[PDB]
Design an enzyme around this catalytic site. Structure first.
Site, PDB file in Angstrom:
ATOM      1  N   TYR B 120       0.854  -1.177   0.000  1.00 21.63           N
ATOM      2  CA  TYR B 120       0.000   0.000   0.000  1.00 21.63           C
ATOM      3  C   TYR B 120       0.893   1.231   0.000  1.00 21.63           C
ATOM      4  O   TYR B 120       1.867   1.292   0.756  1.00 21.63           O
ATOM      5  CB  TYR B 120      -0.929   0.026   1.217  1.00 21.63           C
ATOM      6  CG  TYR B 120      -1.769   1.282   1.298  1.00 21.63           C
ATOM      7  CD1 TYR B 120      -1.271   2.441   1.889  1.00 21.63           C
ATOM      8  CD2 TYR B 120      -3.053   1.316   0.770  1.00 21.63           C
ATOM      9  CE1 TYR B 120      -2.033   3.593   1.954  1.00 21.63           C
ATOM     10  CE2 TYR B 120      -3.823   2.461   0.833  1.00 21.63           C
ATOM     11  CZ  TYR B 120      -3.309   3.596   1.425  1.00 21.63           C
ATOM     12  OH  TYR B 120      -4.076   4.737   1.484  1.00 21.63           O
ATOM     13  N   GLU B 208      -3.449   7.226  -4.243  1.00 23.66           N
ATOM     14  CA  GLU B 208      -3.479   5.997  -3.457  1.00 23.66           C
ATOM     15  C   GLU B 208      -3.280   4.805  -4.384  1.00 23.66           C
ATOM     16  O   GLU B 208      -4.075   4.590  -5.304  1.00 23.66           O
ATOM     17  CB  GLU B 208      -4.797   5.870  -2.684  1.00 23.66           C
ATOM     18  CG  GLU B 208      -5.023   4.502  -2.050  1.00 23.66           C
ATOM     19  CD  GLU B 208      -6.314   4.431  -1.258  1.00 23.66           C
ATOM     20  OE1 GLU B 208      -6.263   4.548  -0.016  1.00 23.66           O
ATOM     21  OE2 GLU B 208      -7.383   4.261  -1.881  1.00 23.66           O
TER      22      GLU B 208
END
Ligand SMILES: Nc1ncnc2c1ncn2[C@@H]1O[C@H](COP(=O)(O)OP(=O)(O)O)[C@@H](O)[C@H]1O
Ligand SMILES: Nc1ncnc2c1ncn2[C@@H]1O[C@H](COP(=O)(O)OP(=O)(O)O)[C@@H](O)[C@H]1O
Ligand SMILES: [Cl-]
Ligand SMILES: [Mg+2]
Ligand SMILES: [Mg+2]
Ligand SMILES: [Mg+2]
Lengths: 235, 235
Positions: B120, B208
């Protein structure tokens, strides 16, 4: 006469065969764009640039201006541009062409493949026997005639019924004689069937796949794939 | 507001990042054609069909008519057609949408990739610090907020100088904190730099990447690649 590799591979695909036809390009700019767009699907992949000329021995040939090789690996679209720019509009010299060379105005841009095995396979009308024949071998000595004379046991010849064509039993046995097992047996059977349909329905004098390969897909499945292709006709 | 996955990935690629933007299809028949043409370059490859909807949780969502998943693996172009036929023009239901679901009128057709690691990584505007921050982790517990609360040490925070951007020293350390070594270190550095240029030059409120992946190319080279992407803006 013969048709070019990428067209021969397209014909094989139309009849259900697995073949890397890539994409044809008539400029280095287009070749670069092809490679750049392929990075949308397999980011980081390498590329191969293959001169589309009506002559064999491209891999080991050399261009009149100095670059060596008609089949060249490229790491990036810009390397694809540079290599294609040395092929398109220039003269390639191979064993088959002699010193006269052959003009090139186009290339195939394809993805670089992981190749596990390379086979030779051809289909032609065998005048001596009086029927079509499938010829194949797993040796990697390039010259089919060379292997035939140094190892007759290495060459498999399958006579084909002029009327009914290949039988499943003939093709399954050929696949196992070439050393294939598991799913690759039927995979090879289906591919050779397609190749024979090309030979038969397109009135070809020879369908020659050198090499017919076992490759890995990007997720490591082993499949049969034509890595080169030459289809001849009488006109 | 947010833009779709494929648009975010194209933007990342424009700034030098590696991302699988695939190719978008506005109909099931186009989705099939895309997959079929990809078999010219990587014969035998599998495919992934990704619903392009402005909502998250597609992987585990389900369609109003029964099909499970907004991200689905397919073996052939015809399977791609069948899957796209249930996505395009239909309603997907995820955690983020609730029972009302969300309409889908287009998909991404992608090549199936071998994924070795999933990270992530996000870039946010941090008002407490008055500057951007990069947040990253190698954990696979889905919820970034969940991992953050159960293991704050698993999350790496990097404050960014707006004047200088991320430094090589900051990014090299982040790459090693995420477990990368060898060529992947510099690879990750270059990709995160590109992600910051997206964040900065496109005036984004959030970039993101969930997941940022280590993938294998078709010839088994390990490279960094954005496998999903969400870029937010303020209207
Ligand atoms: N996509 C590919 N990726 C990697 N190697 C390839 C690819 N296509 C062909 N090759 C290799 O390039 C060699 C030479 O290409 P080929 O098509 O056989 O031309 P030629 O017979 O004119 O030299 C092949 O024997 C094979 O080993
Ligand atoms: N080309 C691909 N091949 C294989 N798996 C993929 C591919 N692209 C994405 N994935 C996987 O699919 C999962 C779900 O996809 P993603 O883009 O994250 O959608 P979402 O997060 O909205 O559910 C990801 O966790 C990723 O690991
Ligand atoms: Cl096929
Ligand atoms: Mg050859
Ligand atoms: Mg995601
Ligand atoms: Mg692999």
């Amino acid at each position: 006469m013969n048709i070019h590799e990428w067209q021969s591979k397209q014909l094989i695909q139309k009849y259900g065969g697995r073949a890397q036809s890539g994409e044809v390009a008539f400029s280095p700019e287009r070749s670069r764009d092809i490679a750049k767009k392929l990075w949308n699907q397999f980011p980081g992949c390498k590329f191969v640039v293959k001169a589309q000329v009506l002559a064999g021995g491209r891999g080991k040939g050399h261009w009149e201006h100095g670059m060596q090789g008609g089949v060249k690996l490229a790491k990036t679209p810009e390397e694809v541009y540079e290599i294609a720019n040395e092929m398109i509009g220039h003269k390639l010299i191979t064993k088959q062409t002699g010193a006269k060379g052959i003009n090139c105005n186009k290339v195939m841009v394809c993805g670089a493949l992981k190749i596990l095995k390379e086979f030779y396979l051809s289909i032609l009308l065998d005048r001596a026997m009086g029927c079509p024949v499938i010829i194949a071998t797993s040796q990697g000595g390039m010259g089919i005639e060379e292997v035939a004379q140094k190892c007759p046991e290495c060459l498999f010849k399958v006579p084909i019924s002029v009327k009914n064509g290949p039988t499943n039993e003939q093709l399954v046995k050929l696949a196992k004689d070439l050393g294939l097992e598991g799913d690759l047996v039927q995979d090879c059977v289906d591919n050779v069937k397609a190749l024979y349909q090309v030979f038969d329905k397109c009135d070809s004098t020879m369908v020659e796949i050198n090499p017919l390969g076992v490759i890995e897909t990007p997720t490591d499945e082993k499949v049969i794939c034509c890595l080169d292709a030459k289809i001849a006709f009488d006109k």
